[PDB]
């Protein structure tokens, strides 16, 4: 079942709980990409210095 | 309808009726610690948690080679040392005396009742209890601290399913893990070769046959538990098979089973079907003919020993071969033993593992396990058998709590609710029986993210476990001392030691990650920190090994854990706050309230549902169609059956929510129009309200959520009247109320003194003050608000202030998130805050010469003498700035070794040489403030100086004037009640003389108590404090800094919209309307589409109607209208729109002028988090205030004067101010000090400020063609003693040149690598 | 480096050098005392572990 209402008409108590699953997963990924991208650029620059 | 609501009424748009009021927001902290104290003294002490449970487990002492038993009679709590206000200034940690009564029972070690010695001695001062305050905060060393809850795994058994990570064998759901409460854990894992393996809490691999042999079971008994036994006999056709119709279901038969006296059943190569299954029950045949080739795949269960042969021809639990039939045929064994086996279902996975290990004897397996835990140890049979039995079968080093025994019976399937703590032999084999059933396809693996498997600890559980680990250390030390000593020679008090007990309490509040500092900025941050529950700490997962399952939300978090409240950063998901209606269960789980729904109507019965029991009932939605009869009139209602969201029929509803706000937390319940914003902005909006600084002027928000009133009462900063009555006298320092004769005792009725605290230094360096809001002659009741604390206005939480806001890009000043401000926001002092800084000085004891604090110091100018007093303390109220000295501290020195350059300087001055240096405390650079208070501390036995007597005298004079004032009130009250009893004097008598004698004895009782309350207070003030060894006198001076708003400050709203002020533009450049009212804050409208927060725009439109209606009420007062006309206008506001309407219950003249003067600055509106007003109701309010319903109006520019082409949106938005001032962020340093090993610039001292040139900064310079710049900031500007000296001289002369030099970071690597024996030819 | 209160600080390397120096002098003074084989093999291991 999808979410019928939108942000203007207002969400329900149960419809707003569904949008939290995708939001928390998005906020949890931006905290991990800062460590993997910073680790990826260190291995590529150590082999292209000479 | 109380008295505090008669001043300000808040209109609410809530359309759903309230069934259950919001409980105490700190009920999880007060009731959790109350069980730890157990102040109730009855005959049967309810022992479920606390120190009383630890005094009953380790109470009996089993003395080795002796007879000494100690019986614990009980404990008694003592009176506190100091008050809550005296402990924060003296630092006594608010300790509580602990007295225990122990009984010494002696015996002759003969197991008889002869020569019994009974000594009863009660030990005093055994330990110190924290004894937290009423708000829930702990006072440790004069600093406020709190104990957050912990969310860890529940003790029990859990089954995991690996995702093919072992050997890529598809899916393996046979990972069994048992986590007990205390002691080592045993885990059962399956090898890729289909072999069971038990794993102790250590890196090792033990077979499953060794675990069964160590318990005492043989190979034949263990084989019967895995597979059932079968019967066989050799009669007729040399054999007879017992055919079971259930075992042959689903098994292909390649043999002939045509037996049955001419009745065929299954032919060769035919798969048995349900039709062939029904053929066997009607016939009832039990014996069939099977060739000897089919029995080869089977195995025996026990050893086959024929009585005629006399020797064992077949071993127990061994596969059958062709030679086994030759031995069994000649023996003619009528009875044949075998085990069950089936390739279709119930595969013998553990049967193959028993033959892999050489577990022949039970004693041989005990020494093999002890060798795995201790390699190279002595192979003793009696020594190893004692350690194994004391690991999983003894009360020592293995304790299973009551919460673990209840959970273990639910997973296994036992009917016993309560079980023993020590694991039994039946419980160890029952886990292996449930593990092999899940592998065959019977059952599923459990989930670790389910709230039914997790447990939320409390402050009372951690204090009891930390006290038990410290009590067992004092119980063990007393056992080794009392057993080797005589009962008459050793005293009962000296037998036990209080050192390990008192040390365990101090280390728990100073070395634990859970016990942390309490941030004190606004009353909203105080309640959020006490309710915040984390998953880290002792006995929990850290930030790195969490992964993604722990950092994710689960559908079982509905009404228990806030899904939207989570601190951003590295720890996302680990820390999550509780819900509003969250309540702990009896075992420790989370429970949420729900309503009882019947088939016909909805009853008013409210029950608290657990986590595991919520999967059966169908939970409906909090908001549904109601036809005023208790029955749902909707065709389809959103329900939840099993952790899923789906629409169901209205005839299947069994439960219903209590309120829509039961999902969000307290911090998230303050964001209006939350249903229109996104879940990402709701998480960031909850953090802007947490880091709010209390301003100088507190203004209530025009739009609220309704929870702003119930959040200030639960906080400890607001003064709540305990006894209702008439306010006799009110002042800015104290509030005195007179208690009525109804709710009072017989004596000392009107005795209540409320002392308001002044500006004190908080934990976050913010001012805290309380202002009175009641006048003399106003009656109050129980629960009324007499005075408000910080960020509080008449009982309502007022974090920031509000102003006129617009939405238009103004010359690019609001580029992405920047905010443009006007001049009226800084001229009216709206965001001006007050900071309180603490500066302390200590007088050490040097080995050269000991000297106390002296004001006379050498090498000082006449400018410091005028400000410094003769004692050595600056006056209270001076403008102390950078370079001014606070106290005078002399430091003795020796061996000056005056250089010839210094001798010439001392001669041109004329003054004599002084060897004493000046190391007095000064103000750091960039800090300016005003002294408001100075506190002194003197050790015991030292002489008081001229400063210790000035403050001490002023304190006792205030207490005496406060005690004499209360004595005058009770004196006149006793005489007034006495004069109102007898008749008037003109021109029985014996009863009136007794009343005069009672009045004379009444004033004598208050007088005798007056000196006792004055003598003990003078005793505490004259008693010195117990400071640390090596200090003589410690002085603390406070500085008050009034930081004004400046460009660069960080300002945000309530919907997660951060911002930095760019330029404070004058009042002429701001866009104004046709009337001439300019706006103060201009925002950026481009942030709405990406950062989807529709509630931010709906708040601006609703805020315009709140201030728009306030102008009509204030203008109506200036026209001197009748009171009957104002009551009609107020009725057109509260009784017009849908929601709560309250009126026609106040006084005509008195209450109308009181509400009109309070609502002249805006009508407060309440908008719930999920029951907000629709768009049709917002436009209806603008029509009443003669405002455009569209919410937009064309504004005139102030610079060019031309009217804008498109209409803009104006209104009033509640803004906040965050603690991100630029005074603590701006830093600059050219030259400073360096270290010794590495000549690098330092940071964190009085003068500091520098940027670390990281490795990623180096790769940015290498990407360019820059070579001289990269070498400059790496060799010359740092790590060069002789390089920086010559470089600084070249800049002053005016010659820009650089020398090569040598980096100091490289010379250290040369000397350190040469000590290892490696040669380095650096010169070459 | 001394700090406030008359106290000073010593690095962890000063303790390692002190342990190897005193054990070296205990071996430098046991070269003419006619030490048997039972102790001449253990006193060398005290220096090897340092």
Swiss-Prot record, chain B:
Top-level taxon of the source organism: Bacteria
Enzyme Commission number(s): 2.7.7.6
Top EC class of this enzyme: transferase
GO BP, one annotated term: DNA-templated transcription
Cystine pairs: none
Reaction equation(s) it catalyzes: RNA(n) + a ribonucleoside 5'-triphosphate = RNA(n+1) + diphosphate
Pfam assignment, any one: RNA_pol_Rpb2_1
Signal peptide start and end residues: none
GO cellular component entries: DNA-directed RNA polymerase complex
UniProt-listed InterPro entries: DNA-dir_RNA_pol_bsu_ext_1_sf, DNA-dir_RNA_pol_bsu_external_1, DNA-dir_RNA_pol_su2, DNA-dir_RNAP_su2_dom, DNA-dir_RNAP_su2_hyb_sf, RNA_pol_bsu_bac, RNA_pol_bsu_CS, RNA_pol_bsu_protrusion
GO molecular function: DNA binding; DNA-directed RNA polymerase activity; ribonucleoside binding
Matching HAMAP family: RNApol_bact_RpoB
Record-stated family: Belongs to the RNA polymerase beta chain family.
SUBUNIT field: The RNAP catalytic core consists of 2 alpha, 1 beta, 1 beta' and 1 omega subunit. When a sigma factor is associated with the core the holoenzyme is formed, which can initiate transcription.
Known function: DNA-dependent RNA polymerase catalyzes the transcription of DNA into RNA using the four ribonucleoside triphosphates as substrates.
Alphabetized NCBIfam families for the sequence: PRK00405.1 (NF001616), rpoB (TIGR02013)
UniProt-recorded name of the protein: DNA-directed RNA polymerase subunit beta
Source organism per UniProt: Pseudomonas aeruginosa (strain ATCC 15692 / DSM 22644 / CIP 104116 / JCM 14847 / LMG 12228 / 1C / PRS 101 / PAO1)
From Swiss-Prot, chain C:
Residues of the whole record sequence present: 253 to 302 of 1399
Gene transcribed to yield this protein: rpoC
Family, similarity comment: Belongs to the RNA polymerase beta' chain family.
Source domain of life: Bacteria
Organism: Pseudomonas aeruginosa (strain ATCC 15692 / DSM 22644 / CIP 104116 / JCM 14847 / LMG 12228 / 1C / PRS 101 / PAO1)
Subunit and partners: The RNAP catalytic core consists of 2 alpha, 1 beta, 1 beta' and 1 omega subunit. When a sigma factor is associated with the core the holoenzyme is formed, which can initiate transcription.
Stated role: DNA-dependent RNA polymerase catalyzes the transcription of DNA into RNA using the four ribonucleoside triphosphates as substrates.
Protein name: DNA-directed RNA polymerase subunit beta'
């Amino acid at each position: 079942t999808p979410i019928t209402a939108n942000f203007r008409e207002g969400l329900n108590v149960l419809q707003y709980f569904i949008s939290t699953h995708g939001a928390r997963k998005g906020l949890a990924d931006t905290a991990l990409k800062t460590a993997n991208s910073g680790y990826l650029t260190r291995r590529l620059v150590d082999v292209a210095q000479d | 309808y109380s008295y505090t609501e008669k001043k300000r009424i808040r209109k609410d748009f809530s359309k759903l009726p309230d069934v259950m009021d919001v409980p105490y927001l700190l009920a999880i902290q007060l009731d959790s610690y109350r069980e730890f104290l157990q102040a109730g003294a009855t005959k049967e002490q309810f022992r479920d948690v606390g120190l009383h449970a630890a005094f009953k487990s380790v109470f009996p002492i089993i003395s080795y080679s002796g007879n000494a038993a100690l019986e614990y009679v009980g404990y008694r709590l003592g009176e506190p040392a100091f008050d809550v206000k005296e402990c924060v200034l003296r630092g006594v940690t608010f300790a509580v005396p602990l007295r225990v009564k122990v009984r010494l029972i002696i015996f002759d070690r003969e197991s008889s009742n002869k020569a019994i010695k009974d000594i009863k001695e009660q030990e005093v001062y055994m330990g110190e209890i924290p004894l937290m305050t009423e708000n829930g905060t702990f006072i440790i060393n004069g600093t406020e601290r709190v104990i957050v809850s912990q969310l860890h795994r529940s003790p029990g058994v859990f089954f995991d399913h690996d995702r093919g990570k072992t050997h890529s064998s598809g899916k393996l759901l046979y990972s069994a893990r048992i986590i007990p409460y205390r002691g080592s854990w045993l885990d059962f894992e399956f090898d890729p070769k289909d072999c069971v393996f038990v794993r102790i809490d250590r890196r090792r691999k033990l077979p499953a046959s060794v675990l069964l042999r160590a318990l005492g079971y043989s190979t034949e008994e263990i084989l019967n538990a895995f597979y059932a036994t079968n019967v066989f006999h050799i009669k007729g056709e040399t054999l007879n098979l017992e055919l079971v119709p259930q075992r042959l279901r689903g098994e292909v038969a390649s043999i002939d089973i045509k037996d049955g006296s001419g009745k065929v059943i299954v032919e060769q190569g035919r798969r048995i079907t349900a039709r062939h299954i029904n053929q066997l029950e009607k016939a009832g045949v039990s014996q069939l003919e099977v060739p000897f080739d089919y029995l080869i795949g089977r195995t025996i269960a026990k050893a086959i020993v024929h009585p005629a042969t006399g020797e064992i021809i077949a071993e127990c639990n061994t596969e059958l071969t062709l030679d086994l039939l030759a031995k069994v045929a000649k023996a003619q064994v009528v009875r044949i033993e075998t085990l069950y086996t089936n390739d279709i279902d119930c595969g013998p996975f553990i049967s193959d593992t028993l033959k892999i290990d050489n577990t022949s004897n039970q004693l041989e397996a005990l020494v093999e396990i002890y060798r795995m835990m201790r390699p190279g140890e002595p192979p003793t049979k009696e020594a190893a058998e004692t350690l194994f039995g004391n690991l999983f079968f003894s009360a020592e080093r293995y304790d299973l709590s009551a919460v673990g025994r209840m959970k273990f019976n639910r997973r296994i399937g036992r009917t016993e609710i309560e079980g023993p703590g020590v694991l039994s032999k039946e419980d160890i084999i029952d886990v292996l029986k449930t593990l092999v059933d899940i592998r065959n396809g019977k059952g599923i693996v459990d989930d670790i993210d389910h709230l039914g498997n997790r447990r939320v600890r409390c402050v009372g559980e951690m204090a009891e476990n930390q006290f038990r680990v410290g009590l067992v250390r004092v119980e063990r030390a007393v056992k080794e001392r009392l057993s080797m000593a005589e009962s008459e020679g050793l005293m009962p008090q000296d037998l036990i030691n209080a050192k390990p007990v008192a040390a365990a309490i101090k280390e728990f509040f100073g070395s634990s990650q859970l016990s942390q500092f309490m941030d004190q900025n606004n009353p909203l941050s105080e309640i959020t920190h006490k309710r915040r529950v984390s998953a880290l700490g002792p006995g929990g997962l850290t930030r790195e090994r969490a992964g993604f399952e722990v950092r994710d939300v689960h559908p079982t978090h509905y009404g228990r854990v806030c899904p939207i409240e989570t601190p951003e950063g590295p720890n996302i998901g680990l820390i999550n706050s509780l819900a509003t209606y969250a309540r702990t269960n009896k075992y420790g789980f989370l429970e949420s309230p729900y309503r009882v729904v019947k088939d016909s109507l909805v009853t008013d019965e409210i029950v608290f549902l657990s986590a595991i029991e919520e999967a059966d009932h169908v939970i409906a939605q909090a908001s549904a169609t109601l036809n005023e009869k208790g029955q749902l009139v909707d065709e389809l209602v959103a329900v939840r059956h099993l952790n899923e969201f789906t629409v169901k029929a209205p005839e299947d509803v069994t439960l219903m929510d209590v309120s829509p706000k039961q999902v969000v937390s307290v911090a998230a319940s303050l964001i209006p129009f939350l249903e229109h914003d996104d879940a990402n902005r709701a998480l960031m909006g909850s953090n802007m309200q947490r880091q709010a600084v209390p301003t100088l002027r507190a203004d209530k928000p025009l739009v609220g959520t309704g929870m702003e009133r119930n959040v200030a009462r639960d906080s400890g900063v607001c003064v709540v009247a305990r006894r209702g009555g008439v306010i006799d006298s009110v002042d800015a320092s104290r509030v005195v109320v007179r208690v009525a004769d109804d709710e009072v005792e017989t004596g000392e009725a009107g005795v209540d003194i409320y002392n308001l605290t002044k500006y004190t230094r908080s934990n976050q360096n913010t001012c805290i003050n309380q202002r009175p809001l009641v006048s003399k002659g106003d009656v109050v009741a129980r629960g009324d608000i007499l005075a408000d604390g910080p960020s509080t206005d008449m009982g309502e939480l007022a974090l920031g202030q509000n102003m006129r806001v617009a939405f238009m890009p103004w010359n690019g000043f609001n580029f992405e998130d920047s905010i443009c401000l006007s001049e009226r926001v800084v001229q009216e002092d709206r965001f001006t805050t007050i900071h309180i800084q603490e500066l302390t000085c200590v007088a050490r004891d040097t080995k050269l010469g000991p000297e106390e604090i002296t004001a006379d110091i050498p090498n000082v100018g006449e400018a410091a003498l005028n400000k410094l007093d003769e004692a050595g303390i600056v006056y209270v109220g001076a403008e102390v700035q950078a370079g001014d000295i606070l106290v005078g501290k002399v430091t003795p020195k020796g061996e000056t070794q005056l250089t010839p350059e210094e001798k010439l300087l001392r001669a041109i001055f004329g003054e004599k040489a002084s060897d004493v240096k000046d190391t007095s405390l000064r103000v750091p650079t960039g800090t300016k403030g005003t002294v408001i208070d100075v506190q002194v501390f003197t050790r015991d036995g030292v002489e008081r100086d001229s400063r210790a007597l000035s403050i001490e005298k002023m304190q006792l004079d205030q207490i005496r004037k406060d005690l004499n004032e209360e004595f005058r009130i009770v004196e006149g009250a006793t005489f007034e009640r006495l004069r109102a009893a007898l008749v008037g004097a003109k021109a029985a008598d014996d009863a009136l003389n007794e009343q005069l004698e009672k009045a004379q004895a009444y004033i004598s009782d208050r007088r005798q108590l007056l000196d006792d309350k004055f003598e003990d207070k003078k005793r505490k003030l004259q008693q010195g404090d117990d400071l640390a060894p090596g200090v003589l006198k410690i002085v603390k001076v406070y500085l008050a800094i009034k930081r004004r708003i400046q460009p660069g400050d960080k300002m945000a709203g309530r919907h997660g919209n951060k911002g930095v002020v760019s330029v404070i533009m004058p009042v002429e450049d701001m866009p104004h309307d046709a009337n001439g009212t300019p706006v103060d804050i201009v925002l950026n409208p481009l942030g709405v589409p990406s950062r989807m927060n529709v509630g931010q725009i709906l708040e601006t439109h609703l805020g315009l109607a709140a201030k728009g209606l306030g102008e009509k009420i204030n203008r109506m007062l200036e026209e001197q209208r009748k009171v009957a006309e104002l009551r009609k206008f107020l009725h057109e506001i509260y009784n017009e729109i849908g929601g709560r309407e309250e009126n026609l219950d106040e006084l005509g003249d008195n209450e109308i002028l009181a509400l009109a003067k309070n609502l002249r600055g805006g009508v407060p509106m309440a908008t719930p988090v999920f029951d907000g007003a629709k768009e049709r109701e917002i436009k209806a309010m603008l029509k009443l205030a003669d405002l455009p319903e569209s919410g937009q109006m064309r504004l005139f520019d102030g610079r060019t004067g031309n009217q804008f082409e498109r209409p803009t949106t104006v209104g009033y938005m509640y803004m906040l101010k965050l603690n991100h001032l630029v005074d603590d962020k701006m830093h600059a340093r050219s030259t400073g000090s360096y270290s010794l090993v590495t000549q690098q610039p330092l940071g964190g001292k009085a003068q500091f400020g520098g940027q670390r040139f990281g490795e990623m900064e180096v790769w940015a310079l290498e990407a360019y063609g820059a070579a001289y710049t990269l070498q400059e900031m790496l060799t010359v500007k740092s790590d060069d003693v002789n390089g920086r000296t010559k470089m600084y001289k070249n800049i002053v002369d005016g010659d820009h040149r650089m020398e090569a030099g040598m980096p100091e970071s490289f010379n250290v690597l040369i000397k350190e690598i040469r000590s290892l024996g490696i040669d380095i030819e650096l010169e070459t | 480096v001394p700090l406030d209160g008359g106290r000073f600080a010593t690095s962890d390397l000063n303790d390692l050098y002190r342990r190897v120096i005193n054990r070296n002098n205990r071996l430098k003074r046991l070269l003419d005392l006619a030490a048997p084989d039972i102790i001449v093999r253990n006193e060398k291991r005290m220096l090897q572990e340092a």
